[PDB]
Amino acid sequence: TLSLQLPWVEKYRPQVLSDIVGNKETIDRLQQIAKDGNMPHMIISGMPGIGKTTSVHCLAHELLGRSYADGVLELNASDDRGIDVVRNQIKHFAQKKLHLPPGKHKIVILDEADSMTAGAQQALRRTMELYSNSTRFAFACNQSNKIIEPLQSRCAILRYSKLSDEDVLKRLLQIIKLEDVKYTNDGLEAIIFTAEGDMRQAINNLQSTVAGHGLVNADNVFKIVDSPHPLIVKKMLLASNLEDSIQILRTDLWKKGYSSIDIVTTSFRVTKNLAQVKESVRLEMIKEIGLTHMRILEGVGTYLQLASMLAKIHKLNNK
Amino acid sequence: INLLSTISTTTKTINHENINEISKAWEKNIALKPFDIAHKMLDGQIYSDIGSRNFTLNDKIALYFDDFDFTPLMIQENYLSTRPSVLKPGQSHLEAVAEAANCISLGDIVEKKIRSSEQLWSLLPLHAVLSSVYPASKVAGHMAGRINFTAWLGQNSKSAKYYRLLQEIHYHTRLGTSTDKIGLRLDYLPTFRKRLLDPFLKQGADAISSVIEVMDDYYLTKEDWDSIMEFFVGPDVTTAIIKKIPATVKSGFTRKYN
Amino acid sequence: WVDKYRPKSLNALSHNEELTNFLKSLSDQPRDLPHLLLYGPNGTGKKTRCMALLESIFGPGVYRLKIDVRQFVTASNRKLELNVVSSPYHLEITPSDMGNNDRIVIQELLKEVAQMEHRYKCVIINEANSLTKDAQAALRRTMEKYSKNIRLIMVCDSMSPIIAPIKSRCLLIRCPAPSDSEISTILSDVVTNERIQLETKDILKRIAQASNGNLRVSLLMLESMALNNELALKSSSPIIKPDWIIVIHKLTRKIVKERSVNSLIECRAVLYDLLAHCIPANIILKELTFSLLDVETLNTTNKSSIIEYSSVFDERLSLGNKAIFHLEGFIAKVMCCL
Amino acid sequence: RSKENLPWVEKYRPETLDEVYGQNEVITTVRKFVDEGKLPHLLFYGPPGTGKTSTIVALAREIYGKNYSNMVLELNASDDRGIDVVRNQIKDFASTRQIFSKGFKLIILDEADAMTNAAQNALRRVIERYTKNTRFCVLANYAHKLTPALLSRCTRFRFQPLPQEAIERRIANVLVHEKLKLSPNAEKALIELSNGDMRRVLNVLQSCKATLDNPDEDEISDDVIYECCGAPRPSDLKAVLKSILEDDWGTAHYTLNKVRSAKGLALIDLIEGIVKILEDYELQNEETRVHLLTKLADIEYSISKGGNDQIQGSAVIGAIKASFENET
Amino acid sequence: MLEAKFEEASLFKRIIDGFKDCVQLVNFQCKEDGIIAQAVDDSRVLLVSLEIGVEAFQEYRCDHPVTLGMDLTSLSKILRCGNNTDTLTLIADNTPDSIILLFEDTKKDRIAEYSLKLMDIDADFLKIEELQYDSTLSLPSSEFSKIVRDLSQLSDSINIMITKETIKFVADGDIGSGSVIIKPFVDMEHPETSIKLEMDQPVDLTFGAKYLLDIIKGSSLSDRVGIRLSSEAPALFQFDLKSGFLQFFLAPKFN
Amino acid sequence: SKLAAEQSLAQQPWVEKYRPKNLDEVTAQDHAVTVLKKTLKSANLPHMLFYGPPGTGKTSTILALTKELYGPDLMKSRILELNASDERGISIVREKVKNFARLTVSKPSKHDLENYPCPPYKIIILDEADSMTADAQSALRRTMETYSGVTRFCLICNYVTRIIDPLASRCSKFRFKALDASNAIDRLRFISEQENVKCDDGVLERILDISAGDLRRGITLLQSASKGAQYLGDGKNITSTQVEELAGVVPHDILIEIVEKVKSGDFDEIKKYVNTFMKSGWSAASVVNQLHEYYITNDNFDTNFKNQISWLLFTTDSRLNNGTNEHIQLLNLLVKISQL
DNA sequence: ACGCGGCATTCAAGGACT
DNA sequence: GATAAATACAGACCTAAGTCCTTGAATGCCGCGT
DNA sequence: CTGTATTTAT
């Protein structure tokens, strides 16, 4: 078909701050700031798909009213991460004179701010303070650690958290009711489980299920969206017997098409994040997994090395 | 001040009831300096059963990742200067030190693999574990003395300087001697001392001519002589020997060579 | 001196007559000569035999060596300089002086001399073990493509670092170390020519047995003890051991006596002191292990564990840039064994 | 050329969405997506030779027609993975219209797992901003290399390794296109050695056709397949394993040496086959499996680093014998 | 064999310089009617369609159809090796490989023989669609290039609006905005300076500054440029030569 | 011209003198040369992966195939050779290789088509493709695929594991078998007869046995033995013991001495005998090979002893192939066998 | 024709890589 | 004014490696004015 | 940790 329909993530992107479901304290604080005015400098950080860009965009829209065209400067940090940007474009926008409602000021939105280079970030330090009376900067990034500490000092540290299953279920139910989709409770629960708090993943998976099969049922959602790799990897690592681990590997990972490097990397990540196993045993399994990773990266990527790694882990656990 | 401004928009009374949530959301995550990483990584409470839940393994890996160029060196330099407190029943301090050193050897292998022509940077968490966390967990406890800085850097620079000097000396004497760079230091240098420095020790200022003949036989200079006199170790150190040589002898040697 | 008396021709060689006959057999028809790789114990006389073969193939002017400087550029803008000893009929490359950039020196200089051209020029790679695997991989095709213009002769001590294709492409010439009797005969000739008074001749055999087959070390030790006894060797003349030997021996005594971490302080201190003064770590491990084996107090189990851990940490050293990181581990493991 | 002078791997590349087999779920899901028009951002991650590139090229043909090479920005991410690409080419293509016909824009990124992290961080906003008139497809063999942000904005489809039936149908189509015949046992051996990759199947089929003296009338038997591929026959594998298990060391060494020398089989393939056979076994104790797997893994790694073939074979014999000696 | 001779060696120089920056890969296919060249930019935003005719060549001979592919970066380098007072000769053998360029001047006996290795460019679609565009206008090339280069400094997007006898170029950026208003006027004294505009329906679309600046590099070929616009159709930027034309097909942005 | 090259080759090392000029001269790697010969008639050469032990004939086979395809004169224009001596980074893959592949096939001359097939493509030969990084091979992944119409790719590597999986998947895998005595004996006999080399009954078989799957080493050994025999002037035949002496082969008596010293479990005596042994240049790998042969072949040792000694020798070989010190590993192995 | 004047392009140094 | 609490804070910074990225300096060609 | 520096307290 020549034309396409808009995705549900962008078509149903919240246009007001109330539609945002998660992080109730932060959303209420941003709504109070929007009503009262005098927006402070901030960095918004968290996981992908929990509503950081949407929150800042709704805040800017509501704060600036009809003046969003001029008062808002949109600059994807990854696209424009040079000191030249700060020297010319950001500085000229900050020195720009614009008549606004009393409380409100001009807003700079720098999405994906974690990718800004050191030079541009350091140059922004004085632009943040010199033109603060007229210009207010806003930062959105996946990881706040990439942003230098002095820049974090000048702004409010507003930190987001992974979306709870209840809020994702509420948003999914709202979209389902609005667009008349047939669903089952098991299917919605499975979509929430696969999303793992990423609302964007949940909505994309709902779109895929609806378009492909037409009914939101557990069977369809599992065929169209596979079970999360770390869970099968953890089940393989935490099996009681060696033969069980070998069987889980052969069936779920090797025969299904997962690569050796992916398997070993996910095993390392799961092992480092495991909590039931004591730290010493966890560390020695990490050692064995790292040896297997070294062999795979040197070029020996085979079922034999993965089985040997499982055998070493089981020997380590069996004392 | 920014926290006070931002919080006060919604909550008008900051009290002891919400101080915990305010602190947990506004805490500064500042990268620890390579000394605080050494202190915290070499701590018994961190690797304890209770401490493991509070400070998880991923936190330890991130603590490494704060400084990925100095933590392996700091742990290697200060893993055997701590009083252990996590020793297994039937394990002494020396056994834990040996296991930790084995782990640092594996971590050095991993680092060489990462920092070579292959550039296997995906093994960086494995290096974090092998270099910092496992060796420190083996010898975790209380700091006996002070946390010293890595001595490997200065000794490596000294080794590079001495290798440059040995290269110059070997290439000067290449025509005379059919040797390699290492073999010269291994074998000839002790005899070169006996043919250069000992005559000044026994014959006196009259052995200057023979010494000059020896240097001219292999195209050596005063700088070459000084560099060879700085190459010996242990019993054969010449730092005090050259001082005890009369200043007249050294001055006459310099003037005669010039 | 060692350099004072060195054979300058094949017919002047006096030890391992089989090797001399093999070299003359190769020199009989020199237009058909494979690439060579001289290997054997260090100090045998492999370089002398290679240069004698060169003199046999070419004229007697191969010994007129001249040092030249050939600046090279690495992948980065850094400038690197090499001293290339050269002769009218041959040139010598010792890539151990450079670090990981020996590959560049190989591929540029050898290809250049190939384009430059008794139709072949022999290149002597004195240090072949320090050649990185990448450098040998680059040299793998240089030997075969330019076999009509350049014929490499390689000097080596242990063939294990050298990769299989390089050994395959080149003829292997074994060099047995001189026997004690031949070393004693050479020392007798030297002392006769150098006018060194000998009280008896058992001194020469003692020096030969204290060199472990090395002739360079034998002559150096001869002259070293000739200076401490006023050019007159006596029966009770002490055997001159180099400084690093004494330091390593004291290290073994300390490891045998004090098996503590507090002793590990000074053990690491001595290892650092040795490493900072132009001493390789593999040599340190070899001498330390063999001196530890010579300790009479230790029983067979300790000796076996020591040699096992020595092999393990030798592998670790061979696969590791930071040498003390493995040396300290070996010493600590030996202390735990004891 | 006429597409007749090309290797069978490229000659038999699918041209329409109906010639891609095995990935039926993905094929029907994508066909229904394009038919109804809600085509989301696609992520085809799977093992090599599963048809991901063929699937997306057939998608381009079915979406835009025969003129699909000019209305689609197909970028080899391995060849050009810089952030300059995202800033200039990808962004200008997404922003602008089509020079040929009205319609949406599709950008296919092949081997995006080699893209630098800066490039993906730049793309994670280009994809979102221009979603109204541009769609992105990401193909990557490895999903760990790709940034997590790039895995949140693209719908994920997993390309399973090609099953038996799809490989049989493609083999039949290739056999019909050429003048060739395949024995059922030879086809079974080819399927087993394929490991789910059609690339290997086509390469081995072409090599066996070349091997055939007069391909017009003769048949490719299992012997031809094994000889041209070089893989060991199952009979040789069983004989070697039986000789190692319950025979004397001298006889076992003789059997392994004669099996290797007679057919030219490599030792590493013998180890893989022996691992496959002994995995199917039912073992009394756990320790024997652990020892067998560990020792065989180190032997295979040392073979990957090279060395002495006879020593490695004797090591295999000793490891197997000790492991089954633990079962007493 | 192909033996195409230019009386003005600088003509092919100017044509190649017109679209050297726009594209690097172009298929110069030579037939009996003349040389036809077509190429697409890496971003696939501009279509270049060159059509040289036999009248341009002093002597043109093409035995059989031939497709000559080359790199514009290297070919332009080859062309800068000729003086103004020379005659170019394009030579290609029966099998297309290693095109030969000959720069000859007979007043002072000099010969310049240069070669360029051909490349296998698979894309040979060779399609342009004649459409009844909503508006067809013609203005001097220098004025259009001046307007484009003056408005490209304000922003990266230039908006062109066609209304009843009014042509407007609008560029709104971060430092400000600007709009140039011109009307179709006919001057009898100097016909070259006149501006024509035949409009059917109002036209409103936006283009990119980089591609527009790349297009105006072709102003060195002809003194007047014709621009044809239509609703959601490729804007046709046409430079008419003595024997043929050079057309830039731009794709507008999305509203 | 041809006479000068013929004389030059007539006096060069025998490793290069008898380099196979044609595909027929390949001695034992039939399973690949038959495919290339049947592709000679056609023009559908697949992407090829040549992986095998060193000295098996991959380079010779791929140098004869392109010759038979294109002709001596045409081959230079149609062939790009890039070894490990040239840079193997991403840039050399994205610029040199891409430009060469993108270039149109060069025009064959009238002499070329009449005699030689001259297929309408060109082969890029990448010697030692294992040394290349995974990034360069990833870049080549689509470079070979897109331009397969006019360009063909051949990769030669000692170890197939170094090559990334998709690259090996695209290229056809041709395993060059080891060149043992049985398969290369005819070639070695031909070379010996061509130079009038005189040997006993078992010299050639023993030469190939010591070579252990490498024809290059056997050729070099035969050349050295012939040179020694010619220098001797005795006029007799080369004897197997002479070859073993010239091949770095430990004498049997010394091997029995080491075995006897291992039998008596005294650490000091074993250490002394190894110290005396390393005073001769017997390579450690050549000692481990003979120890393995003697211990495994002999039937006087128990099965468990064989199982343990095989793993010990495997570990020693693995450690020795990493660049360790021969003396320490040899002593460790001998001590472990003594305790066995 | 002949000389500056910005502006595009090429070169070189520093930092980072989970 | 000296000596304790009570605590914040400094101890130090290397050389290679491959490839992408950015920033400033040095470089080139091309348009306008006289 | 050890050693040095600064501010409030005795």
Ligand SMILES: Nc1ncnc2c1ncn2[C@@H]1O[C@H](COP(=O)(O)OP(=O)(O)OP(O)(O)=S)[C@@H](O)[C@H]1O
């Ligand atoms: N499902 C399939 N049906 C038919 N032929 C297939 C299929 N999968 C692979 N092939 C064949 O294998 C060739 C390679 O397919 P590709 O799609 O290029 O491989 P791939 O799945 O993209 O894996 P890469 O290239 O390593 S990422 C095709 O040209 C076909 O000839």
Ligand SMILES: Nc1ncnc2c1ncn2[C@@H]1O[C@H](COP(=O)(O)OP(=O)(O)OP(O)(O)=S)[C@@H](O)[C@H]1O
């Ligand atoms: N199959 C063979 N038939 C005849 N001679 C051979 C054969 N294989 C090797 N040779 C001889 O050995 C020489 C070298 O062969 P190569 O093909 O270079 O070996 P190789 O496979 O390249 O080993 P590498 O380069 O170390 S992987 C040839 O010139 C021949 O003299």
Ligand SMILES: Nc1ncnc2c1ncn2[C@@H]1O[C@H](COP(=O)(O)OP(=O)(O)O)[C@@H](O)[C@H]1O
């Ligand atoms: N808390 C939320 N409530 C409602 N929708 C959400 C929420 N979080 C994410 N979304 C949906 O996800 C889509 C994109 O999320 P976005 O805000 O871009 O993620 P990120 O915060 O990582 O930038 C939006 O269209 C929005 O509909």
Ligand SMILES: Nc1ncnc2c1ncn2[C@@H]1O[C@H](COP(=O)(O)OP(=O)(O)O)[C@@H](O)[C@H]1O
């Ligand atoms: N056949 C020989 N006869 C006499 N002296 C010899 C002989 N071979 C070696 N030498 C002595 O060895 C010295 C050089 O040893 P060298 O060749 O550097 O050892 P390496 O084998 O480690 O290169 C010379 O000074 C020479 O006197």
Ligand SMILES: [Mg+2]
């Ligand atoms: Mg966002």
Ligand SMILES: [Mg+2]
């Ligand atoms: Mg693909």
Ligand SMILES: [Mg+2]
């Ligand atoms: Mg080769």
